[PDB]
Structures are given as C-alpha cells and as structure tokens.
Amino acid sequence: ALKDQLIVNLLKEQVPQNKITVVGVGAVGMACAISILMKDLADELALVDVIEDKLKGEMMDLQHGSLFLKTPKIVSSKDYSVTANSKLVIITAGARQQEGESRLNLVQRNVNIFKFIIPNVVKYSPQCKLLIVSNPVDILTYVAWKISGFPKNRVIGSGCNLDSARFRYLMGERLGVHPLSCHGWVLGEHGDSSVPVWSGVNVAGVSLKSLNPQLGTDADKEQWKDVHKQVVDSAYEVIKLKGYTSWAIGLSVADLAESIMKNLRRVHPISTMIKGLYGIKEDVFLSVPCILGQNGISDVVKVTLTPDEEARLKKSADTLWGIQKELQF
Amino acid sequence: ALKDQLIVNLLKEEQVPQNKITVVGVGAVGMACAISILMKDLADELALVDVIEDKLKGEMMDLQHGSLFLKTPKIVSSKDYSVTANSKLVIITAGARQQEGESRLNLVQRNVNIFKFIIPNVVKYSPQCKLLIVSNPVDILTYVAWKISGFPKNRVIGSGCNLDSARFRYLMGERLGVHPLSCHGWVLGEHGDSSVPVWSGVNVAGVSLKSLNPQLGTDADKEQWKDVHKQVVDSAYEVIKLKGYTSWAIGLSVADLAESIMKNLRRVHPISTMIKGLYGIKEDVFLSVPCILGQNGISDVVKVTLTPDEEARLKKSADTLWGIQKELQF
Amino acid sequence: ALKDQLIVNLLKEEQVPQNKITVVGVGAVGMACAISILMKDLADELALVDVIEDKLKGEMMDLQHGSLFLKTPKIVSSKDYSVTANSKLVIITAGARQQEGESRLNLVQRNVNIFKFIIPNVVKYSPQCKLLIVSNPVDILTYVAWKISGFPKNRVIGSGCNLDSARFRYLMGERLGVHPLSCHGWVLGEHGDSSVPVWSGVNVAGVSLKSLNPQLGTDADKEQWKDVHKQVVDSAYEVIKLKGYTSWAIGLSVADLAESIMKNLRRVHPISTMIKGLYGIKEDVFLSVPCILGQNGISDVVKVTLTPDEEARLKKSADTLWGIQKELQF
Amino acid sequence: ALKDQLIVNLLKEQVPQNKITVVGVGAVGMACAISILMKDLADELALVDVIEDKLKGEMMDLQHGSLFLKTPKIVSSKDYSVTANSKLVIITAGARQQEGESRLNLVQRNVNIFKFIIPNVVKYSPQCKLLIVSNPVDILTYVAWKISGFPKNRVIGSGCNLDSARFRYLMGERLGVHPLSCHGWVLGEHGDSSVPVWSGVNVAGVSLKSLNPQLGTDADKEQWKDVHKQVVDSAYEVIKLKGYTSWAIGLSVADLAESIMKNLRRVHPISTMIKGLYGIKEDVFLSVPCILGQNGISDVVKVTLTPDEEARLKKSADTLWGIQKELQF
Ligand SMILES: Cc1nc2ccc(NC(=O)CCNC(=O)NCCc3ccc(CC(C(=O)O)C(=O)O)cc3)cc2s1
Ligand SMILES: Cc1nc2ccc(NC(=O)CCNC(=O)NCCc3ccc(CC(C(=O)O)C(=O)O)cc3)cc2s1
Ligand SMILES: Cc1nc2ccc(NC(=O)CCNC(=O)NCCc3ccc(CC(C(=O)O)C(=O)O)cc3)cc2s1
Ligand SMILES: Cc1nc2ccc(NC(=O)CCNC(=O)NCCc3ccc(CC(C(=O)O)C(=O)O)cc3)cc2s1
DSSP states (O other): OHHHHHEEEOOOOOOOSSEEEEEOOSHHHHHHHHHHHHTTOOSEEEEEOSOHHHHHHHHHHHHHTGGGOSOOOEEEOSSGGGGTTOSEEEEOOSOOOOTTOOGGGGHHHHHHHHHHHHHHHHHHOTTOEEEEOSSSHHHHHHHHHHHHOOOGGGEEEOTTHHHHHHHHHHHHHHHTSOGGGEEOOEEBOSSTTOEEOGGGOEETTEEHHHHOTTTTSTTOTTOTHHHHHHHHHHHHHHHHHHSSOOHHHHHHHHHHHHHHHTTOOEEEEEEEEOTTSTTOOSSOEEEEEEEEETTEEEEEEOOOOOHHHHHHHHHHHHHHHHHHTTOOO | OHHHHHEEEOOOOOOOOSSEEEEEOOSHHHHHHHHHHHHTTOOSEEEEEOSOHHHHHHHHHHHHTTGGGOSOOEEEEESSGGGGTTOSEEEEOOSOOOOTTOOGGGGHHHHHHHHHHHHHHHHTTOTTOEEEEOSSSHHHHHHHHHHHHOOOGGGEEEOTTHHHHHHHHHHHHHHHTSOGGGEEOOEEBOSSTTOEEOGGGOEETTEEHHHHOTTTTSTTOTTOTHHHHHHHHHHHHHHHHHHSSOOHHHHHHHHHHHHHHHTTOOEEEEEEEEOTTSTTOOSOOEEEEEEEEETTEEEEEEOOOOOHHHHHHHHHHHHHHHHHHTTOOO | OHHHHHEEEOOOOOOOOSSEEEEEOOSHHHHHHHHHHHHTTOOSEEEEEOSOHHHHHHHHHHHHHTGGGOSOOEEEEOSSGGGGTTOSEEEEOOSOOOOTTOOGGGGHHHHHHHHHHHHHHHHHHOTTOEEEEOSSSHHHHHHHHHHHHOOOGGGEEEOTTHHHHHHHHHHHHHHHTSOGGGEEEEEEBSSSTTOEEEEEEEEETTEEHHHHOTTTTSTTOTTOTHHHHHHHHHHHHHHHHHHSSOOHHHHHHHHHHHHHHHTTOOEEEEEEEEOTTSTTOOSOOEEEEEEEEETTEEEEEEOOOOOHHHHHHHHHHHHHHHHHHHTOOO | OHHHHHEEEOSOOOOOSSEEEEEOOSHHHHHHHHHHHTTTOOSEEEEEOSOHHHHHHHHHHHHTTGGGOSOOEEEEOSSGGGGTTOSEEEEOOSOOOOTTOOGGGGHHHHHHHHHHHHHHHHHHOTTOEEEEOSSSHHHHHHHHHHHHOOOGGGEEEOTTHHHHHHHHHHHHHHHTSOGGGEEOOEEBOSSTTOEEOGGGOEETTEEHHHHOTTTTSTTOTTOTHHHHHHHHHHHHHHHHHHSSOOHHHHHHHHHHHHHHHTTOOEEEEEEEEOTTSTTOOSOOEEEEEEEEETTEEEEEEOOOOOHHHHHHHHHHHHHHHHHHTTOOO
C-alpha cells in the first residue's frame, strides 16, 4: 500500500477534547458552524439535522475548506451518536417566525421538537453544556433544562447577547465610536418586551444618563428610545429584506461558545433562571448579565434597576410566565 | 447634543479607507466570501453590491449587527458602484450558476453579458484595485474581465483551481491520515471538467508519491488515485445535488487569496492567469498555474515541470478554454 | 540562475509597503512590542532601529528566522532611518529606563537629548506617520516629540495610562473573579505616581461599584480599593525589583494601540494627548484621558465627569508635569 | 462585601481543560510563553523555575497584559504542584552553550537537571505530552523518555522544526517567495550534523535539484550549500550578536504546541526514536518528519533519501550515539 510505503505507523483511536455539536443546519446553524470554525474553538465539529442530503452537503462543503481551517474533524449524521463527548451542544433547530409574527408564536412547535432533540443530546453527552438558540429562546431554555435534567448552570440561552450587540452597534454609529467602547445592556426577553438599561449606558465610564436625565424616556429630545425600538425590530426588518437572519446570531453564538470553551468568565446578557431576583418567584428564564465559563453560568451580576426599569423587567418576566404556564411536555 | 457633551471633536478628517474590499454579488458565494473576509480581519471597510435592493440591504444589515464581534469598522452597500470607491480588492461573484448536469461553460453568454455592466462600473471608482473573479466559467471570465477592464494582467486574477487543489489536498489528507496543510498536490488548468492533477508534484514532506508508486494516477494504479482527481472534478456537482449550491469552501478559498493580496504575502496559488508562452500555448488563454500572489496581484508565475502526459492534458484544457474564448463578442 | 528557471517575472513592483510599522529601540520593551505586533498581523513590513549594531542585527535575524510562523513578509533593521521610510506607525521605545526605586521623571533630560536625534530622522522618512511614544516620562516625551516633529497633535500619541488602566482592570478582575474584559475602570493623568483612578466610572455590566460602596477609593473603604490603584502605581517598580525590567504587558498594550491605529477601529483608550482647554488646564500639557484612536490618531476626546477631588488630583498631575516641561531645552 | 453586593454566586468552584506549563523562565521559556498566549492555545499557563524573584516578576509581567489576552489564569511556583493537570509541558530549562561551545557539551549539566525536573513534571501531569526544548535536544528527549516512563509518542523534541523554518526563510529570501510556499527539510541532529534533504526542496512541487542537479554541492554556481551552512551557524551567529536566541525558537515551539493542542496531525521535523530506519540499530533520537497531534508523534514519514543524504543522516546518528552511550542517570 502507498500509505505504508510512505508512513510508519507508531500508534493506532481518536477521542476529541474540545468537540462542539450544532443541531440544525438551517442558515442560523451554518452561521454558527462557520463562525465556530473560523475562531478555532473546536477540534471536532458535529452537525445534526433531519434532512439527510442537506446535512451531508453542508458537511462536505465545510470539509472542502479544511485546508483553510484548524478543525481537523467535521462530521454529520441524523443519528445522535455522532454528537458523543461534546463539551458544548448548540440547539438551533425549530420553526422560525414569519415576517410580522412574534417569536412567542413558535412556542408549542419548538417544544415538541425539543421533546425529541434534548434526550438524544443528553444520552450521548451527559456532561455537556447546552446552548439554546431556537426561539422563543427564554422559554426553550427552561424547557431544555426540565427535559435534560441538567443543573441550571449548564443550560444557557443565547438570550439578549445579540440584542445588546445590536444596541452597542447602533449606539456606536450615533456616537462615532466602535461598539467595543460603547456599553449598554438589553435584558429580559429576547423579543418585544426586552429592557434597555439606560442607567448603565456609557462610554469610558461616563453615564449617558448623567448628561441627559431624560435618556430613553418619551421626554428625550434625542429620542434614544428609538435605539431600543430598532433593537426590538431588528429581526423583523432583516426578515423583511432578506427573508431570515443568520450572520449576527452566528457571531453572537460563537462569542458565547468562546467564553465557554476557553473558560473566560466574561459577562454576557444571556438566558438563565432568575427565581429570587427582582421579586420573581417562579422558574422563569430571561437575560441578566451572567458570568460564563467552562461550567456554564456560575454567577449573575445584580444590576441595580430604577423603578421604571424594574417595572419593565417585571413585565417581561410576566409575559413569559404567561406562556410557560400552560406547557406540559 | 449628547454626542457633543460626551465627545470633544479634535479633528475634522475626511479619511479614505486604506484596506477596502468590495464583494460584488450577495448570493450564497458572495456572502460566504464576506463572512470569511470579516473573520480574517483583512479589511478596514467592506462594500457589498448587487441588483436586488432588499436582499442587499438585509445582508448588509445582518453583518453590521455582528460588528461588536468583528474588527471591520465600516460595512456598506448599494446598487450604485460609488459605494465601492477606493477598494484595494474587488471580488466578483455575480452571475448565473450551473444546474445539476450543466457545464460551467454553458454559463458563458449569460455571465459575459453581466460582466459587460459590472466591470466598467467597478474599475471606475478604484484605481488601485486588483480584480478577483469567482463567477464561472472563471478562467474565461478572468479573460473577459481583463479585456473589458483594460487592466494589466497582474491585476486580474481568477479564483481558478485554488479550491480544486484544496479539495485535492483534503481528499489526499483523508487517504493518508495527514492534515491537508502537510499534503501537497496541484490541480491546474480549467476550474472544471478538464482540470489536470499534477501527480509528479504530489508529496508529503518532500517525498514524491509517484516515486514510491510509479503507477500513481494511471489506470494501472492499484490504489486508484485517479479517483481522487475525479472526486475533485465532481465535487461542485456532488454538493449542488445535496444542498443545492456550494458556498463555504469557495468562500474560504477566496478569503485565502484575499489574504495573500491584502497582506502582500507572496505565497504561491493555483489561480487563473494568462499562460501564452508556456507549454507551447501561443494564444491568450487564461487558466490555473502556480502563481506568486501579492499586493500587486500576480507578479510572477511558477513554471511547473510537467511530464509529457501532464503537459498534453494541460494543453487539452487550454484548447478547450480557447475554443470557448473564440465564441466571445465584445 | 535557478530563480529564473523556476519563476517567470511579470513586472517590477515598487514594493512600497501599505501597512509598515517601525519600532525604534530593540531593548526588552521594543522587542516585546515587535513580537506582539508580529503575532497580531498588523503590518506588512516591520522595521527596527537602534544604535548598538550587533544587538540590532541579532534581534532582526532572530525575528526573521520565525517568518514561516508569521504573516509579515519583510522584517528589516538599520541604524539608518532610510529603513523606516513610508511607515504608517513609528513607535519610539528608545531611552533610559528607571532602575529600582528611580522615578520616571528622573529620565527626562537623557531621553529628551536622545529624542533630539530620533524625532527629526523619523519625520524625514515618514512625514505622514503617526508617532507613538512609549519612552518615559511619556507625557513629557510626547510633548517633546510633538514640538520637534511639527506634526499636528492628532498624530503624536503617548502610550500613557493604557497600561495602567489594564493593570487596574486585571487587579479588579482578580478581586471579583471576572475577566478584565468585563471589568471597566479608568486611570488617567500622568503615567506614574500622580495618576488618578476614576472611581465614579469603575463598573461591571454598567453597575457602579461606588454606588454599592460609597466609600470606594477612600481611606474609609472597608475593602481598601485604594490599594488597587496603589498597586497600579507601584506595578513597574515591583516588576523591576523582581526581574530587573518590564516588557510583556507594555508590549501588549502598545500592540493594542497599534491595532486601533492600523485598523481604524475608533476604540477609546486612556493615552497621552494635549488636554489644553479641559479641567482648567491653560498650558500645552499632554496627559492621559479617554481618546478615540483611529487611522488619523486621536480625533476625539471623551469628556470624563470628574468629582471635585478627582478633577483636583488631575489638575495636580497636570501642574507637576508642566513644571518640568516648560523649562526643557531643545 | 462588595463582590457579594455585585455578584450572586450560583455554583461552588475548577480543573483546566487546556493547560500548558513552561519550565524555565529564561529568554527562551518566556518567548514560548508569550507566543503561546498570543495563539490562544491555553486556558491556563503555568511557569516553573528555581530563581524565585525572576519567576514572580515574569508571571506578574504576563498577568498585567491579561486584558489583551484570552488565557484567564497565569500561575507560577518553584513547586511542581502548580503544574497539575497540564496537557502539555514544555522544558526549556538548563545551561546554554557559550560562543564556540557545542550544544553537545551541555549534556551532563542538563541530564542532571532533568533527573529532578522530569519526575516532578510527570508526578503532577500523567496525561501530558512532554515537549523538550533544552539542549542537546535530541539526547535530552531520549533522557526525558527513559526517566518519565512515558511512551515514546508522548516525549517530543523540538528538534529541527527551527532549523527547517530557518532553511525555508533563507530559501524564500533567495526566491522572492514566502516561506510557507518554500519547502525543504533539514533532518537529523539539532546542531552541527543536521542534514539538508536537497532532493525534497521544492516550490509548487517543482524539485529545485531537478532544475539544478548540483544543488547543495560545492559545484553549485549559486552555492545553496551556504544556505545549510547558515542554518547550522544561525544559533552561533545570533548568540554572537545579541547574546542568546529566543524568538525563533519561541515561535517554533508555539507551532508544535498548536499541532499538539489542536490535534492537527501536521508534519514536523522533530526528535523521535529512529531505531529500525536507515539501518540505525540503537535507541537514538533525532529529527525525521513526524505527524503530530493530541497523542504526540503517531506516525513517521519515511523520507526517501539519496545515498549521500542517507550517509549524512547515519553520520548524524553516529555522533549522537557517541555522546549518548556514555550517559549515566
Ligand atoms: C425532531 C427534529 N429534529 C430536528 C433537527 C434539526 C432540525 N432543523 C431545523 O429546524 C433547521 C431549520 N430551523 C432553523 O434554522 N431555525 C433557526 C431559528 C432561529 C432563527 C433566528 C434567530 C435569531 C433572530 C431571532 O431571534 O429571530 C435574530 O434576533 O436575528 C435565532 C434562531 C429540525 C428538527 S425536527
Ligand atoms: C448587471 C448585473 N449586476 C449584478 C450584480 C450582482 C448580481 N448578483 C448575483 O448574480 C448573485 C447570485 N450569483 C451568485 O451567487 N453566483 C455564484 C457563482 C458561483 C457559484 C459557485 C462557485 C463554486 C463552485 C463552482 O465552481 O461551481 C464550486 O466548485 O464549488 C463559484 C461561483 C447580479 C447582477 S446582474
Ligand atoms: C541617539 C539614540 N538613538 C537611539 C535609538 C535606540 C536606542 N535604544 C534604546 O534606548 C534601547 C534601550 N531602551 C529601552 O528599551 N527603553 C525602554 C523604556 C521603557 C521601559 C519600560 C516601560 C514600561 C514601564 C514604564 O512605563 O515605566 C511600565 O510601566 O511597566 C516603558 C518604556 C537608543 C538610542 S540613543
Ligand atoms: C533543578 C533545576 N530546575 C530548574 C528549573 C528551571 C531552570 N531555569 C533555567 O534553566 C532558565 C535558563 N535556561 C534557558 O533559558 N535555557 C534555554 C536553552 C535553549 C536556548 C536556545 C535554544 C534554541 C537555539 C539553540 O538550539 O541553541 C537555537 O537554535 O536558536 C534552545 C534551548 C533551571 C533549573 S535547575
């Protein structure tokens, strides 16, 4: 054999140490995949979906670029045995919202899908961290948590990580500063009831609210509330123009995967259980700033909310428990 | 204003971008090129151009929303080529794509017609640009971009066989249990059915595979290495048949070429250039041969030493491509 | 000749680089700057300059030998500033460094005399560069570079408190068990003993530490956070006492600023610039405040809302610096 | 407490997943450290030396740059407990050659130090790969292998990875081509008896020797043999000029760390046992092209050498054994 004339083998299997699985090879799952590959976060990437040809073709397309990557194994199957020994399993599967339709309207269809995905993930990686991206993300993270049986630290929702990045993009464009230097937090539900925390909005530690006490309210002459309205409407606008969103969420997810895989312990506004904070007494999930690392969410930052901000969060939390109420699974 | 209370402007500056890239076409390929380029930190400005206004604005916006996680401070788009002004590299990914069982060569009249609009508009605003053609048939379209643009040949590059050779090296690597980076091998000629695997150059750590098995790549080859080249030719149609199109691998291949041009690396790639003068080819044929790629595009060509059969195959590729070039009307 | 048998040349390029960085000084600091810049792929040419010829050639060769692992295709050095021609960024790390216990201000006459030779040579070969001063006392030396160059103030930048702030964020990170990337806090003014920690701006996730502990940064502070700023001030001294000099952190900090400059990022950094017109400063004093840094250097300053005490501490930091500064001979 | 006002702890404290240790905080050691930090290869970096102040100063100086890095933990100590659970341990400690002293004259000093270092490293990191950098590297890889009790695949000498990079640089400089596209192997000893394999030297698969049959001989009108002489003399020449070498070895070691940490299975010219190749009968370690991954060296490429190249390699082997046979430990 040519191989044996060229190479002397000194050692025969191959068990991966930093394997990530993406479930779902729609535009979101593939944006996640490419972003993860291009940040060198994994030594093995695994893809899962229910449409076989699509799945195989996406896999092969990625494999063809292997010369330009540093992830030496890309695999795919409809069978979840392909996901075994994953450190991180990202779930991007499920129905997506139509133009002009709330994410809340996807809830029952995605819960039924999760009734199938999640036990299969747990079976083959019982110690992985779950990163839920599918919408409505906050409820679907609760559902993943109940179905998996994992401790809460290891079930993370992508939440408002993207919402906050969009906020910082828009704030950046207004101020003429890079988003990395513009700080601002969008908390609560990833959707219409998200809460811009105007109190924390700042550049170089300078509170924008101190310079404009009306910041974010109807009294704001500069109308900064529209920045949050633009954050809320962003998906809707992108959906209207191109039919769907993919790139920003892929970057946003790869950002969270970077914190988890490298144990960075950066703070991200992501979905976690908030029972105990802000008078919330149920098993509700929504975005608060969390410390994220190798063990998932280890700690939560307690943001000091103004009665207005606290009210709006109360309301976000209420909207979500209102839907989560009726669920069986 | 809140901006003026927070920030004292100290400098009135109308600045031009220094490392600008434009991608023409926001189909799956064009956007794969875009995301790859942005995640490689190659550009200080990215311009996107297309003819479908909504799709264009949406793609732009989706990338912008990712800005926190990137290092490219300005992403812009328009139907109007003024948005491309002062680009260092202009990547052209627009045009019809081949159907299952259709040859890339059948795309010629449709994509030429489109290049007649795109190319003059694109070169108008960027004196310093290199032209990177990705649209198919890429070799013929690189010749066409060259003739329409009137650029010197060093500045008009076809993505060519960079992806073909990347696929070859992936498949070789899988066969040998070695990373494609350490598996060397060149597929030259047409990016298409007449490409030529250069078996004489196929090697790991400078060790020639042909020297160990002189039957390598022939029908007598017991390991049937010729099937690896077949798989290379068949790759686009296999992926098209499965997912409907290809995107990621060509995006990564184009980004690789973008990296060599933007960073003046002078690495060697198999890409489309004029080969008049080599291997007895006396006509203006564009096709892939190993080229040194840098800030001024292709500055030099590597003269590969081909066996008489490899050379006949490369001239057959050349003949095919030349015949199609004779179909062109400017 | 082998080169010519192997390669056909297409054109004679000017080879004038597009993203050249020069580091002046090949001491520990300059070399740390160099390897961080190389490893961040910021430049297409890196040029080194020093007066000790052997050391200079040795460092250049040692960097060259790793080129396979880099993406910076030309690395050059000379005592002659012809080698720095067409730099976009020139980083000056040359001069005396403080011994253990010695003050940065004690370096001033030595490093001023050195800058009398350096700065006019830099300008002759790169009249359009941004100057980044790392030598100490950095606040005074940036003024000196500024006066000597005749450059506009935007293009003469001092590394300032960029490092001091990073040290602060590290120590804060360590106390809270959070990455420094997520712990925010600003140290402004002189880069040295009179720097000012801005306690009002210290926060995680937009949540003010001073709001939770009103006595933050004072003598009353139960947790003694003042010790954190004390640690910042003492950092250089503690490292010098242990290893004889500092290099890595400042190398990283300088490359951070190089990134914002070379990639036109418009990030905000606490670096030295002329603050004439702020905080009741009427003289041409350079010290650190938050600046927007891009391809034209410092285009904007963020007006920080200082407490009366904070503003005083800075007016003091100012006064100290102008005392020495006004009376310099060049 | 302020931390507790700011942060709700949700999870009791952490074992690192991608930890690297560098033993020796000399110029080489720190070059390895900074290169590894700037390549995001580690979630934790440990330093070890025997000079307490220097050790603390270097750790501190690296920590202060943390903001600019993605390795959240940097630790040091004279005590090897600080090295626990490393996946890679890099040994850079030992005397270095004077100007005009062979690396081979360092052997008794550096074997004595390895008798302490190696059992201590292996005590605390039973899963690690050992990357030997200290000189003479080829003999010290053998030594660390016999002391450790590790299988030979997990004891790697940095060997000729640097020499080949040097070769490739010099080659590229001559041809006006980037080193990445200039191929050429220097094998055998990391020292004066290394062997340029002229037969393998090529751009784009074009053999330079085929174009110029006299390549690498005294008959060569262009004297490419002086390229290999420069490779051999590089260390000496740089030591003569700056007092020591650090950056090229640092980067060369980072390159190997990347292939190991990311299971790349790339091919490197590195120190391994060659007993049973080219007729060598003894336990000699020297550089040949090896496939390098998560289990260290899994495979060796059998380079087809010309008779003279082969003789030169056997000669390098002989030199190494003549020093090795007389070793006590
Ligand atoms: C039993 C079964 N097993 C499987 C296994 C796999 C699959 N496969 C798929 O379902 C793939 C198709 N679905 C898909 O890709 N959905 C993505 C959802 C999405 C869209 C947009 C955003 C971000 C966006 C926003 O929040 O709207 C913003 O903010 O920009 C987030 C999430 C189906 C099944 S059924
Ligand atoms: C007057 C006008 N101005 C414009 C401006 C913009 C646009 N925009 C579009 O046309 C967008 C759609 N076009 C598109 O995405 N084409 C991609 C072609 C492609 C596909 C696949 C591969 C790789 C593949 C292979 O070689 O087959 C393999 O090997 O994997 C390479 C190339 C239209 C017009 S009309
Ligand atoms: C006419 C002439 N032309 C030349 C040309 C070149 C050279 N070459 C040198 O002078 C080389 C030696 N000099 C050196 O490396 N100085 C480094 C200064 C330094 C040290 C430490 C920090 C950071 C530190 C802090 O800020 O104190 C902290 O906080 O850690 C910052 C700056 C001399 C001459 S003379
Ligand atoms: C019981 C004990 N435990 C310890 C623990 C730690 C330490 N610490 C040190 O020993 C620190 C100083 N040592 C040092 O830095 N040695 C580097 C050797 C070196 C230099 C240069 C190259 C590359 C070069 C070439 O091959 O020459 C080329 O080719 O460029 C390779 C290797 C001592 C002891 S004693």
